[PDB]
Write a structure and sequence with these properties.
The structure is cut from a larger assembly and holds two copies of chain A (about 525 residues).
Chain A: E1 3-6, E2 9-12, E3 14-18, E4 21-30, E5 53-55, H1 75-78, E6 92-99, E7 105-111, H2 129-135, E8 138-142, H3 148-151, H4 164-179, E9 185-195, H5 197-207, E10 217-221, H6 234-247, H7 255-262, H8 267-274, H9 301-306, E11 315-320, H10 345-355, H11 361-371, H12 382-408, E12 414-419, H13 440-444, H14 456-475, E13 497-501, E14 508-510, H15 514-523
Parallel strand pairs in A: 2-5, 7-8, 7-9, 9-10, 10-11, 11-12, 12-13
Antiparallel strand pairs in A: 1-2, 3-4, 4-6, 6-8, 13-14
Helix pairs in contact in A: 10-12, 12-15
The structure holds a molecule of 3 linked components (NAG-NAG-FUL) (4 copies), a molecule of 2 linked components (NAG-FUL) (2 copies), 2-acetamido-2-deoxy-beta-D-glucopyranose (6 copies), chloride ion (8 copies) and sodium ion (NA).
The site of one chloride ion has 3 residues of chain A, from loops.
């Protein structure tokens, strides 16, 4: 029986057998006051003693959020949907620790993605018992509020100041600072890791003065705050808060009255109107996201990055080979998970409209000009491939490269990976390739479990990735030093070296997407 | 009607329509006295005026040589067999010139491979009318003697001094020096290019003081003199000359009598006994090859290379992804062009015996240790792939890399390519991959001919390669400057950058086969 005394009370955990060993999991520990009633849309408030043995033996509620009902019954999409009840009372975190209890273990804190509109820490692909077992690190993960409830912003107004879900993540990081030594953890060796919006969140904790001392290093998988979906302008946020108000009959003349009104709405009426706060959306819409609130984020983060105002530490950054494909089946014409999606030039052009709402005509021709000079015009999957690359390069890959470039110019070691392995079990079709989100199960070690029907080459790839992530967290260097592995070079402006992750053998290459990102990065920002 | 006056007489050529343009081909011009009778096994003797209009309107005889009868009826092998009559009277060359006649065109001189035992300039994949048409270079190619008739060596004895076939190539290069201005060529801009044994020959003309002033630059495709098959020791040559003598009842006590006796044998009795001058051969045997004769080759060429004694100029060097596969079907157990050749560990070991005759047991275990640590032992094509890589890395790839490394250390620009495109028309099976010999048709431009059933991506690849080879020859720099192409970096010890050639897009990479060649290059030379 395992009871740990925390600053706020005792917690009981549960033992887990993993790979003939034991991990202790403390699932669903609370880290803030439930943000209900009068606390809705406010910054999370600190938690007071229970006393009391809190039983942390199951995952807690996930935060309220719309769910993906596009493919009912389909594992590829439904695997991302919440797997605990939804509730505004969702501010909990999970701790997994090796057994026997470590002495001063390095801590890995996971921040989930989901567009800032969705996600939960209890997903199966985020289960941190493999990492704790195999690498003897402690893994922590937290639920933070998403959608309007986590990011609604009425700028400067503490009733809805914005970034609440980023302040939830932050209060979780404090909880680790204050409490993790009790579980056997080293609060001085804490690495944040996150994917997509979770990565973008990691990148903003790098810029946030209040997070500076809550962690040591950072890992960004498929995301960074400079991605075009990751920060809402003050203009847009205002328009959106008011549009939500209007749609819920909460329009007022006094803004504090708007918020008061919205605090009376049911979680569901808020969720139902989120999608419409915007005249046209895309499959990549982030209606309620991070904003420059003067608190968490003191200035437009592009200025902070350019001028070197951020936590000085090592970063590990990466992307997958086919980032953009996943999104094309949520609204691009001619695209289906259920056929090979060979689309036409005219369809490609219609797709640009779906993904680039407006976007001058000249803007959209320019994408077309850049991506459709074939070599050569023979290949029927030409336009289908091009639309996926457009969406991935713009939304994920070039913004990750440009973040890494700018961060490293201030003197810190940065490591960049290009993940190019398609899981043998991917439920999505072949044409979608190495999709967004599908490195995650490799990082968390799921392929280490033989009972699971991954290939042997995949077990070995995962084992290597886990070692590299763990050495990065413990030592700031993502090497696998024992098995004559390719040495991972730092990424510098100038050479821009990166490491490819695949089952055959990993290469050092240079200047990923050079020609493409010159387009997105220099020209497109029409 | 096109008549050119040469130092030795007039020659008439013939007009050819190529790609809606015209090339003039002068096929089968003689360049030495026929080396018959008393001239057999001797250095080629210069040619005296005919006078006389020599009609150069068809390919000449190929030199005597054994033929590959392993796959009668099969295009994959028979495409390499001679396509003109065999005859000791085979010392002719071919010239292709653009029309209209150029003013001072760069010259490309092709030296064929065939293990020094076979080959001919009249093969269809060596037809230089596409190059002349498309790049307005002049292409020259020569037949030189092969087998015992070209390389028999009784060291120091001018009746059989060795390297005769290398002196045939050399006298052809002089002929270009003396005569090519008459066809519109610049004798000051001459590039040699060659594949396999033809490349090895190019690399020895780089070391040969008598070739120094007969050319400007060099291209080596899949071969270099330091390959383990490319130079015969004086010991071996002596043993082999005597074994041949013995086998033809030509043994004598006086060595000049041996040669005199052999000069009385019929071409055929010599050819028939070549294969046996050696106790055990391999599919890569070179029974009669270059030797250190004190004339063409003044010292063991490994010493010349190490100590920087060679023509100081630019080189272009490359290899194909699957060099070693072609050879495995000529005697490795379990291998067939007619099935997927999945062999077993025990078969793999038997293969090493075929390819490494002797070769201590420890020598052969060491190859096995280096090439059979799988990742992982699951894959059934494991051993089949490993044997091909063993044979390619040892015989072609590492010796080409080590040549390039050592040549470049003395201060010259060198460019290295890794050719990784499998021809859409390859007649050999899929498991054999990107085979030895199959870049050649791309270099000569055959895919530029649409009537020919190559894909569009292959036309474009070939067009690019032709431009790069031509710019190398004309300007010492293998760039394709017009179509936003990847820039080809020089190869330096230290970074060892190389360019990949494939239909999708070409990459700059580093340290090809690093771990493998450390084995062949440092350790194996057991
Ligand atoms: C700020 O909002 C308006 C959209 O007004 C919205 O009303 C909301 C309650 C919601 O239902 C939403 O769907 C609706 O559009 C944006 O201007 C809109 O542009 C289109 C173009 O025809 C009009 O049809 C909309 O009605 C029009 N607004 C109106 C009704 O006046 C505006 O773009 C947006 N500003 C942004 C994009 O930041
Ligand atoms: C691949 O499928 C897409 C997706 O739309 C279809 O899904 C299919 C599996 C099928 O059940 C079909 O009924 C369903 O609508 C096809 O795109 C569609 O093309 C059809 C053919 O006319 C149009 O009617 C639809 O407007 C269009 N769907 C939309 C709204 O995007 C696509 O044609 C198909 N392409 C192939 C097989 O290459
Ligand atoms: C030099 O040659 C001998 C081989 O003697 C050869 O006689 C030739 C005419 C030819 O027919 C050839 O096939 C025959 O071998 C090499 O030594 C040989 O090694 C084997 C081992 O058992 C014996 O069976 C051979 O007969 C033996 N030579 C003899 C007959 O005395 C020798 O290796 C070779 N030297 C090299 C390799 O350079
Ligand atoms: C692939 O074929 C090889 C090559 O040998 C065979 O060629 C086949 C296409 C067939 O016509 C066969 O008759 C011919 O001998 C096979 O290797 C052979 O394996 C057979 C099976 O017993 C042996 O009897 C032979 O000794 C051996 N051939 C030699 C001398 O190398 C091989 O087994 C086959 N493998 C497959 C299908 O994976
Ligand atoms: C635990 O170690 C503390 C220092 O941690 C450093 O060492 C590594 C863990 C590294 O990753 C860095 O994060 C840190 O700088 C030390 O001060 C504590 O006293 C230790 N606590 C124990 C053992 O109780
Ligand atoms: C032909 O050019 C001669 C010099 O050739 C140089 O220029 C390039 C062709 C280059 O590749 C180098 O090989 C040479 O250094 C010049 O001396 C001759 O006079 C020219 N002959 C003519 C035009 O009749
Ligand atoms: C809390 O849960 C544990 C584990 O299931 C159980 O053994 C324990 O009795 C519980 N305590 C109470 C009564 O909350
Ligand atoms: C807006 O209304 C709120 C309701 O409490 C009040 O506190 C605030 O002072 C008002 N301000 C004005 C005058 O707009
Ligand atoms: C190293 O390789 C061994 C087997 O040779 C494997 O079992 C082990 O898990 C590997 N270690 C890492 C961290 O990759
Ligand atoms: C040489 O061959 C040409 C081309 O076929 C022919 O026209 C010419 O008359 C020939 N001259 C002689 C008689 O050798
Ligand atoms: C070897 O025989 C040849 C035959 O002409 C002769 O020239 C040479 O002098 C002889 N040398 C001796 C004595 O071995
Ligand atoms: C350049 O590309 C064009 C078409 O854009 C092609 O027709 C031409 O042959 C190319 N030139 C070379 C040398 O590759
Ligand atoms: Cl899963
Ligand atoms: Cl158009
Ligand atoms: Cl094409
Ligand atoms: Cl790229
Ligand atoms: Cl052919
Ligand atoms: Cl064994
Ligand atoms: Cl395997
Ligand atoms: Cl390699
Ligand atoms: Na432009």
């Amino acid at each position: 029986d395992i009871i740990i005394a925390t600053k706020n009370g005792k917690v009981r955990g549960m033992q887990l057998t993993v790979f003939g060993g034991t991990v202790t999991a403390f699932l669903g520990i609370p880290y803030a006051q439930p943000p209900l009633g009068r606390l809705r849309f406010k910054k999370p408030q600190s938690l007071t003693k229970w006393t009391d043995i809190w039983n942390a033996t199951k995952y807690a509620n996930s935060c309220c959020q719309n769910i993906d009902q596009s493919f009912p019954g389909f594992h590829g999409s439904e695997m991302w949907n919440p797997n605990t009840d939804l509730s505004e009372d969702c501010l909990y975190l999970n701790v997994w620790i090796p057994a026997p209890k470590p002495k001063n273990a390095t801590v890995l804190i996971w921040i989930y993605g989901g567009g800032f509109q969705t996600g939960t820490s209890s997903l199966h692909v985020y289960d941190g018992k493999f990492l704790a077992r195999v690498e003897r690190v402690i893994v922590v993960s937290m639920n933070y509020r998403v959608g309007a409830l986590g990011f609604l912003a009425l700028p400067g107004n503490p009733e809805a100041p914005g970034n609440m879900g980023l302040f939830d993540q932050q209060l979780a990081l404090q909880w680790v600072q204050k409490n993790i030594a009790a579980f056997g953890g080293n609060p001085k060796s804490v690495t944040l890791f996150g994917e997509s919006a979770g990565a973008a969140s990691v990148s903003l904790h790098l810029l946030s003065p209040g997070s500076h001392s809550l962690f040591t290093r950072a890992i960004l998988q498929s995301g960074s705050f400079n991605a075009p979906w990751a920060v809402t302008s003050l203009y847009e946020a205002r328009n959106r808060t008011l549009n939500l108000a209007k749609l819920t009959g909460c329009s007022r003349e006094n803004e504090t009255e708007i918020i008061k009104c919205l605090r009376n709405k049911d979680p569901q009426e808020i969720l139902l109107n989120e999608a419409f706060v915007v005249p046209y959306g895309t499959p990549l819409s982030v209606n309620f996201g991070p904003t420059v609130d003067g608190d968490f984020l003191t200035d437009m983060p592009d200025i902070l990055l350019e001028l070197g105002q951020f936590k000085k530490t090592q970063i590990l950054v990466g992307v997958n080979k086919d980032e953009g494909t996943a999104f094309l089946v949520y609204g691009a014409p001619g695209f289906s998970k259920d056929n090979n999606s060979i689309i036409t030039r005219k369809e490609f052009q219609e797709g640009l409209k779906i993904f680039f709402p407006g976007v001058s005509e000249f803007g959209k021709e320019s994408i077309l000009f850049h991506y459709t000079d074939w070599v050569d015009d023979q290949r029927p999957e030409n336009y289908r491939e091009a639309l996926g690359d457009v969406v991935g390069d713009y939304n994920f890959i070039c913004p990750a490269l440009e973040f890494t470039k700018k961060f490293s110019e201030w003197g810190n070691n940065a490591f960049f990976y290009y993940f190019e392995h398609r899981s043998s079990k991917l439920p999505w079709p072949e044409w979608m390739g190495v999709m967004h989100g599908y490195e995650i199960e490799f990082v968390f070690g799921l392929p280490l479990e033989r009972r699971d029907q991954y290939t042997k080459a995949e077990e070995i790839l995962s084992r290597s990735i886990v070692k590299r992530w763990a050495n990065f967290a413990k030592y700031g260097n993502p090497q696998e030093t024992q098995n004559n592995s390719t040495s991972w070079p730092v990424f510098k402006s100038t050479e821009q070296k990166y490491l490819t992750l695949n089952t055959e053998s990993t290469r050092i290459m240079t200047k990923l997407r050079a020609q493409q990102c010159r387009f997105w990065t220099s020209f497109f920002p029409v």
